[PDB]
RNA sequence: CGAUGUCGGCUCGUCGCAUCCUGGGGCUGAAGAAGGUCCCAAGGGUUGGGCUGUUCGCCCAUUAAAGCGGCACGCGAGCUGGGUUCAGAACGUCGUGAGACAGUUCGGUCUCUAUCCGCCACGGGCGCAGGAGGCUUGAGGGGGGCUCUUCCUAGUACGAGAGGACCGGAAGGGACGCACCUCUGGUUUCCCAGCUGUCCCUCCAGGGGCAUAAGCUGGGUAGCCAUGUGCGGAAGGGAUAACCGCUGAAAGCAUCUAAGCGGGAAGCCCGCCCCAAGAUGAGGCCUCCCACGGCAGCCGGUAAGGACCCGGGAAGACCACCCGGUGGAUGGGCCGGGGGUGUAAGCGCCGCGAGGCGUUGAGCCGACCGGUCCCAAUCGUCCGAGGUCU
RNA sequence: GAAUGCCGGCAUGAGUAACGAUAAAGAGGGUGAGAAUCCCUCUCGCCGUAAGCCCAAGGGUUCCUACGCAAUGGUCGUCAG
RNA sequence: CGUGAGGGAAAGGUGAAAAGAACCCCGGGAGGGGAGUGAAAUAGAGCCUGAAACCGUGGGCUUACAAGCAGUCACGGCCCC
């Protein structure tokens, strides 16, 4: 008995490889799928991403965002169906896994906390060179 | 707390049997498959050294 | 999550800055009210010639929380700050406008008009 | 009234139509019978179940014995099912499909000498105010000279859990015949690797 | 409860706990065999076998991390050089515990012996 | 629930100076 | 009176019913809705605040309701000490005075060890006529027992209107309870990292101690958790309470009753969950050993079995329980995976330098899912049936 | 036979509370009838406006060395005021 | 014990005679067992007599479905004379 592989092999059916990888401080654009009266649309949540906790195939990502003047946070499962895709707007570069401390800062300090991970975004557009 | 204190002496008998579980158990002994003296099951020999076959020990 | 004591920064134009909850409208005995949810709540900071005053005790429809509510989708969202839009007895809102994004759990909760009124709706 | 003994295995969460469904793994079958409970012999209606594959050199010769009457390989856990009368001389996860509500019944977490605050759920002492090495205390436990005496069933701290219960209708998510795998909505009682045991629900 | 909790407390704080583990890993590697309480050793085996298979990769880092725990530059070079290659070809396990049939007279404490093996 | 207020039997204990 | 600690609070309750709510009714000056009044009913429930030491009460906001009482005005070897019985001090008032006042005011030592009963938990012993390993029956006992909003029926019945149902059906809640850890969110005493001062190793670099019983800070797996998730209250059957009848005399009529029958409560019985054959009334089934030697007794070796000892365990205070003991994956190591931290040291390059870049998601790495006999569970010992009599 | 009597002896509570700052230990080697506790060594930890050093009160052989371990030392003891 | 005035205990007996147990044995010692003295050694110095509470070893009877001021009256069983 392999209690650990049981259970990868009940969640095989739903994981998902489609998405792109990514890292705290990118930030990121989440398409995801909405219901509201009754049809059902996409919302992209743009932000920054702050957490990634992991747990395979239960691994959940945290996005942050400002609008319209309030700060909105938004936990995603990385293997929900109702993403329909993610983009990579940009690449930052933290120093932690963990940016919860950018809820205090202005935008200011926020960039230069967190400037562009220019070695990421090569590999980027050296990717998608493709044949 | 008010200091609680035994209300009457324990009689002789009731005692005599709260120490009903007293009794020592005697030490669980095995001959040495060596020396064929008795000792402690796995532990090393205190008479001869040996242990498992070898000799692990000067005794 | 909002308790009795907690202060919310209401989000329009009713004049109304802050107000205190006093209790939670959800049955006999609610600890908590969450998102959609209705309070009573005591006016503790309004601005000059509102349509509400500093002392007015109100309802108001709780639209922002900063503890995380959880989706059937099992996504969560979390705000910066507890927030409300304070109604009338017919869950209508008072003022004309709402300020910044509201939980969507408020069109499932029968608020239309301020989910309509909301810049967005997360 | 059908039946079948297993192992917890873990939990996950699966999506069904948009939305996230909490579930226990339970590794099911297969539960081969070793005994039927007849009531001209033995009183009652049930089935023996068997479940585990036993090292044989580990089972003595009584326990052995019974294994061949049925003609069953040596079996770990010896079960019954109450009102049970499957027509194979094997039970399978099959015996279960999707939608079907289930009970179920497993060994609880065991929290050993537990204190009054986590066994009953008390409030114990203030944490300060002048409380005074009470914070965690049960208060009083009686009235006075009437009737002098504490009742029986008085909640009191001592040991709690590892004990047995059973959750009740808990929806079958999904089944797996090919592994004998049974997810269950929601909680099952008990460790990963615990025994646990699947029956219809009583529940309408 | 304690359910799953792996690693014991041998009535020790944090950092007494530590300085024990590696004040008896230096004699450990000192003297290749001591006579510790059952419990302490039983926790040794560990501790030790870790460092053995760090002298065994022999790159300046483990140099580096063992030294840590075992601060003597002489003792470190004694585990790259003389101990760490006799178990080349072992696969972990460096270490043996076997209990002594007697007990310290002054508290009865049950006694146990760990050595490194051949 | 008894109305008229009623006073204290005991004084509160107080120590004494042990022999 | 060789002492029965005294208000209020807290904690923990249990009980009564003269019932606050929810369930069932009759009468109504009951159209409906909403009430009033009485009957039955003690199963469960009976909110959070402001004031005051307060109980009580008023008040704010809710509610299905915010019930009343008993238990030494329940509960200080359970806590509190605000009230009030000491000594200090002051105001009003009384007294020439010392002092005094159901007049006020500020302050003011609440005792680690439970013997017996009782209660919660857990064992050891013997018994249940042979000795054993399993699996069960359920006498008996405990747990639980709450309730609202909206929608459909239907703006129908009813009503001049305003308003507005019975019955039946659907969805969603509050508090509570049991379990659980996938998610959310905690902790996570050394799992990783950064930082200061100092002292040290070995000078640089790299490290170590100490600053807490983690020096500090940012994070944090398993586990244990709630704020998180699942699930429960039932359904249903039986008998009833108040009440309503059917048939029906005594009494040519009438009558729920005297014969007989039916309907009828959240309550009672059962059903559900848990304990349970010391249920000495000691139950049942499946399987194992067996006709021992010696003098319903004793003695000795054994059979089946078990215990010891050992490695351990989401089991545990010790005990118990459970798994494993070389014909083995039990713990320790080691390996892979997970996970955490977030790009080690060294080198090279750019910079006067603090630094930066590359090698690099590097290095480190508890507990989690596994693999692997490298280390350790060596070797053994003692118990343990011969089956009482009609 | 009783005076919460007087003196003494011996029980009960009980193998119970406790063994006096949570600055902290580990191993190796000696000695010895006996060693967690004595000697040595190495590692670790604590004090450092002291938990170091000198002086005065007070104490009055406790100082040094050899030989001892019945009692004293809250355990042990080969050690010691 | 109290600064002091002052308070103020407990504690007698080997045997006629030390003849006070050479020597041997276990033990580090203490202590014991032999030997020896003695009329007597449970007169062995922790010594005349050596009560009782209290503790223990052996033995007879008895006890793990039973309700208590513990006894008393009857009967039966077992053990002893
Ligand atoms: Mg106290
Ligand atoms: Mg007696
Ligand atoms: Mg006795
Ligand atoms: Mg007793
Ligand atoms: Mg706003
Ligand atoms: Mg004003
Ligand atoms: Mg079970
Ligand atoms: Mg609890
Ligand atoms: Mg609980
Ligand atoms: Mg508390
Ligand atoms: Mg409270
Ligand atoms: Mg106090
Ligand atoms: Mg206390
Ligand atoms: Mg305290
Ligand atoms: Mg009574
Ligand atoms: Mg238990
Ligand atoms: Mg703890
Ligand atoms: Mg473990
Ligand atoms: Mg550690
Ligand atoms: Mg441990
Ligand atoms: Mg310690
Ligand atoms: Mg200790
Ligand atoms: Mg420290
Ligand atoms: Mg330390
Ligand atoms: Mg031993
Ligand atoms: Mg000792
Ligand atoms: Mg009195
Ligand atoms: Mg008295
Ligand atoms: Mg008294
Ligand atoms: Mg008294
Ligand atoms: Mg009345
Ligand atoms: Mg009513
Ligand atoms: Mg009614
Ligand atoms: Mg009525
Ligand atoms: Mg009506
Ligand atoms: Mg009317
Ligand atoms: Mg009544
Ligand atoms: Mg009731
Ligand atoms: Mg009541
Ligand atoms: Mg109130
Ligand atoms: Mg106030
Ligand atoms: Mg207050
Ligand atoms: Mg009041
Ligand atoms: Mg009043
Ligand atoms: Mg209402
Ligand atoms: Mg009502
Ligand atoms: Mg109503
Ligand atoms: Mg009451
Ligand atoms: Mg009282
Ligand atoms: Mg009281
Ligand atoms: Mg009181
Ligand atoms: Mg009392
Ligand atoms: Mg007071
Ligand atoms: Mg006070
Ligand atoms: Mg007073
Ligand atoms: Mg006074
Ligand atoms: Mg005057
Ligand atoms: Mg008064
Ligand atoms: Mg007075
Ligand atoms: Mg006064
Ligand atoms: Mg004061
Ligand atoms: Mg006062
Ligand atoms: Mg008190
Ligand atoms: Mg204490
Ligand atoms: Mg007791
Ligand atoms: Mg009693
Ligand atoms: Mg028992
Ligand atoms: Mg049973
Ligand atoms: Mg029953
Ligand atoms: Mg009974
Ligand atoms: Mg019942
Ligand atoms: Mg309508
Ligand atoms: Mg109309
Ligand atoms: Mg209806
Ligand atoms: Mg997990
Ligand atoms: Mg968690
Ligand atoms: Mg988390
Ligand atoms: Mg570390
Ligand atoms: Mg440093
Ligand atoms: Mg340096
Ligand atoms: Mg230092
Ligand atoms: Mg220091
Ligand atoms: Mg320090
Ligand atoms: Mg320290
Ligand atoms: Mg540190
Ligand atoms: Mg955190
Ligand atoms: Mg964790
Ligand atoms: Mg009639
Ligand atoms: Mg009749
Ligand atoms: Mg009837
Ligand atoms: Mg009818
Ligand atoms: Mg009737
Ligand atoms: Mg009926
Ligand atoms: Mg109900
Ligand atoms: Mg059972
Ligand atoms: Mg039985
Ligand atoms: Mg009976
Ligand atoms: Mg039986
Ligand atoms: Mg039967
Ligand atoms: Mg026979
Ligand atoms: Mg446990
Ligand atoms: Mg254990
Ligand atoms: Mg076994
Ligand atoms: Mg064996
Ligand atoms: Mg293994
Ligand atoms: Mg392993
Ligand atoms: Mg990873
Ligand atoms: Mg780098
Ligand atoms: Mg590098
Ligand atoms: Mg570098
Ligand atoms: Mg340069
Ligand atoms: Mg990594
Ligand atoms: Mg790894
Ligand atoms: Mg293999
Ligand atoms: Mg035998
Ligand atoms: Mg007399
Ligand atoms: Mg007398
Ligand atoms: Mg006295
Ligand atoms: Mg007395
Ligand atoms: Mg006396
Ligand atoms: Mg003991
Ligand atoms: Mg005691
Ligand atoms: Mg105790
Ligand atoms: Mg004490
Ligand atoms: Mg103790
Ligand atoms: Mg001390
Ligand atoms: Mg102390
Ligand atoms: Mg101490
Ligand atoms: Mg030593
Ligand atoms: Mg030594
Ligand atoms: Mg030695
Ligand atoms: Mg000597
Ligand atoms: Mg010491
Ligand atoms: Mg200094
Ligand atoms: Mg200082
Ligand atoms: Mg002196
Ligand atoms: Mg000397
Ligand atoms: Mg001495
Ligand atoms: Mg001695
Ligand atoms: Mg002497
Ligand atoms: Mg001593
Ligand atoms: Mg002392
Ligand atoms: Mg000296
Ligand atoms: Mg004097
Ligand atoms: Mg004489
Ligand atoms: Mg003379
Ligand atoms: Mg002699
Ligand atoms: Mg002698
Ligand atoms: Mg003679
Ligand atoms: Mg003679
Ligand atoms: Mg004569
Ligand atoms: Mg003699
Ligand atoms: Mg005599
Ligand atoms: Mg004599
Ligand atoms: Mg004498
Ligand atoms: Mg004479
Ligand atoms: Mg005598
Ligand atoms: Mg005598
Ligand atoms: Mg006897
Ligand atoms: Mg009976
Ligand atoms: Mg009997
Ligand atoms: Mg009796
Ligand atoms: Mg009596
Ligand atoms: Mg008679
Ligand atoms: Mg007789
Ligand atoms: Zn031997």
Redesign the interface.
Known sequence: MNRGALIKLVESRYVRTDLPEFRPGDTVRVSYKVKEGNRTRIQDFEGIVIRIRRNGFNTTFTVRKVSYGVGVERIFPLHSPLIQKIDIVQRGRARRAKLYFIRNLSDREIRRKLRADRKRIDQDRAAERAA | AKHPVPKKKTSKARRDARRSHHALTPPTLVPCPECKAM??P?????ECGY?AGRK??EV | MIQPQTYLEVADNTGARKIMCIRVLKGSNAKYATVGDVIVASVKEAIPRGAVKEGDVVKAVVVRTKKEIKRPDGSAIRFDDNAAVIINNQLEPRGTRVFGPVARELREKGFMKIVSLAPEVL | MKGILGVKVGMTRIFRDDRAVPVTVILAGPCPVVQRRTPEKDGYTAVQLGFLPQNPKRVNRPLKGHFAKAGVEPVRILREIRDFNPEGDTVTVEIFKPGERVDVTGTSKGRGFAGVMKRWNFAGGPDSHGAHKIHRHPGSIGNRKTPGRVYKGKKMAGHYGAERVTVMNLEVVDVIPEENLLLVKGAVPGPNGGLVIVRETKKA | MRHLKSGRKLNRHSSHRLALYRNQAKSLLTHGRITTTVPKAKELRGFVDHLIHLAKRGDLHARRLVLRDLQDVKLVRKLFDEIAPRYRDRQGGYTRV?????RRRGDGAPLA?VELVE | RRIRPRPPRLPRPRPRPLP
């Open positions: 000792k402690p796995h532990t090393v020999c205190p242990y692990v020990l | 076997l209990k002594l049939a007697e012996l």
